[PDB]
Design an enzyme around this catalytic site. Sequence first.
Site, PDB file in Angstrom:
ATOM      1  N   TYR A  90       0.863  -1.176   0.000  1.00 16.89           N
ATOM      2  CA  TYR A  90       0.000   0.000   0.000  1.00 16.89           C
ATOM      3  C   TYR A  90       0.903   1.230   0.000  1.00 16.89           C
ATOM      4  O   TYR A  90       0.790   2.105  -0.873  1.00 16.89           O
ATOM      5  CB  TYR A  90      -0.865   0.031   1.264  1.00 16.89           C
ATOM      6  CG  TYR A  90      -2.067  -0.867   1.224  1.00 16.89           C
ATOM      7  CD1 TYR A  90      -3.351  -0.338   1.210  1.00 16.89           C
ATOM      8  CD2 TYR A  90      -1.925  -2.243   1.184  1.00 16.89           C
ATOM      9  CE1 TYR A  90      -4.472  -1.162   1.155  1.00 16.89           C
ATOM     10  CE2 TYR A  90      -3.038  -3.083   1.128  1.00 16.89           C
ATOM     11  CZ  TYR A  90      -4.310  -2.537   1.112  1.00 16.89           C
ATOM     12  OH  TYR A  90      -5.407  -3.369   1.038  1.00 16.89           O
ATOM     13  N   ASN A 113     -11.482   1.980  -6.666  1.00 18.05           N
ATOM     14  CA  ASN A 113     -11.163   1.334  -7.934  1.00 18.05           C
ATOM     15  C   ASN A 113     -12.367   0.703  -8.620  1.00 18.05           C
ATOM     16  O   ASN A 113     -12.887  -0.315  -8.176  1.00 18.05           O
ATOM     17  CB  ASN A 113     -10.098   0.265  -7.749  1.00 18.05           C
ATOM     18  CG  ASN A 113      -9.721  -0.382  -9.044  1.00 18.05           C
ATOM     19  OD1 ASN A 113     -10.179   0.024 -10.106  1.00 18.05           O
ATOM     20  ND2 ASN A 113      -8.877  -1.397  -8.973  1.00 18.05           N
ATOM     21  N   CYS A 121      -5.860  -3.955  -8.184  1.00 15.53           N
ATOM     22  CA  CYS A 121      -5.768  -3.532  -6.792  1.00 15.53           C
ATOM     23  C   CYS A 121      -5.535  -4.743  -5.897  1.00 15.53           C
ATOM     24  O   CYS A 121      -5.511  -4.639  -4.670  1.00 15.53           O
ATOM     25  CB  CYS A 121      -6.972  -2.724  -6.319  1.00 15.53           C
ATOM     26  SG  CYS A 121      -8.567  -3.548  -6.490  1.00 15.53           S
ATOM     27  N   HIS A 122      -5.308  -5.892  -6.526  1.00 16.56           N
ATOM     28  CA  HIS A 122      -5.053  -7.121  -5.798  1.00 16.56           C
ATOM     29  C   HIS A 122      -3.572  -7.351  -5.503  1.00 16.56           C
ATOM     30  O   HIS A 122      -3.236  -7.969  -4.501  1.00 16.56           O
ATOM     31  CB  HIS A 122      -5.652  -8.303  -6.539  1.00 16.56           C
ATOM     32  CG  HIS A 122      -5.133  -8.476  -7.925  1.00 16.56           C
ATOM     33  ND1 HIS A 122      -5.905  -8.237  -9.039  1.00 16.56           N
ATOM     34  CD2 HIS A 122      -3.954  -8.959  -8.382  1.00 16.56           C
ATOM     35  CE1 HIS A 122      -5.229  -8.577 -10.124  1.00 16.56           C
ATOM     36  NE2 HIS A 122      -4.041  -9.018  -9.753  1.00 16.56           N
ATOM     37  N   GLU A 148      -1.661 -15.837 -10.668  1.00 17.69           N
ATOM     38  CA  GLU A 148      -0.493 -15.105 -11.120  1.00 17.69           C
ATOM     39  C   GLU A 148       0.790 -15.815 -10.710  1.00 17.69           C
ATOM     40  O   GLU A 148       1.875 -15.487 -11.191  1.00 17.69           O
ATOM     41  CB  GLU A 148      -0.545 -13.657 -10.626  1.00 17.69           C
ATOM     42  CG  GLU A 148      -1.798 -12.919 -11.104  1.00 17.69           C
ATOM     43  CD  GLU A 148      -1.670 -11.420 -11.058  1.00 17.69           C
ATOM     44  OE1 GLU A 148      -0.575 -10.923 -10.730  1.00 17.69           O
ATOM     45  OE2 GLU A 148      -2.668 -10.737 -11.363  1.00 17.69           O
TER      46      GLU A 148
END
Length: 151
Positions: A90, A113, A121-122, A148
């Site tokens: 963050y 978002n 935003c993950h 990912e």
Amino acid sequence: CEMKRTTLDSPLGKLELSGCEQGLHEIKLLGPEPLMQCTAWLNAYFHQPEAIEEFPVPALHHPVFQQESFTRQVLWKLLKVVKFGEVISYQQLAALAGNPKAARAVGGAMRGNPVPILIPCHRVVCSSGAVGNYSGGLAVKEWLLAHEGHR
DNA sequence: GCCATGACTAGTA
DNA sequence: TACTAGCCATGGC
């Protein structure tokens, strides 16, 4: 600029991505060049991440991107410096967005978002190591990070 | 504009 | 771990 709705199926279920011909307005994970252009990227991220940059990001027609704010950079910087797979704190983002003493704001920025997954935003995570929260259920943040390449 | 918020933090028991 | 006393750009009115 008419703002129509095109739904789609993803491994996360259906996800309604609304928007006008000027740009993508939203993309909600529920239980017209831009939209169909965004639709491609989504199926790409999902079933073809092997080359997600090989796909053009659509126009972002939404009040948050039209004006100039912190929330602006934070989002803009979130998809321009935090690539597929990568993870960022963050705070670390708040640095990118200028003011580094403002991570907490990067939060309200994140909830603000409208285009998740597109604007990851993950990848964002508490500095404490804890993979914080997510609007569409923490479950989704898991799968995403996972897909990912995480454990 | 001021005052309350909340998806953040680094510090301390 | 568990509470905290800074630190913040928003949102509301």
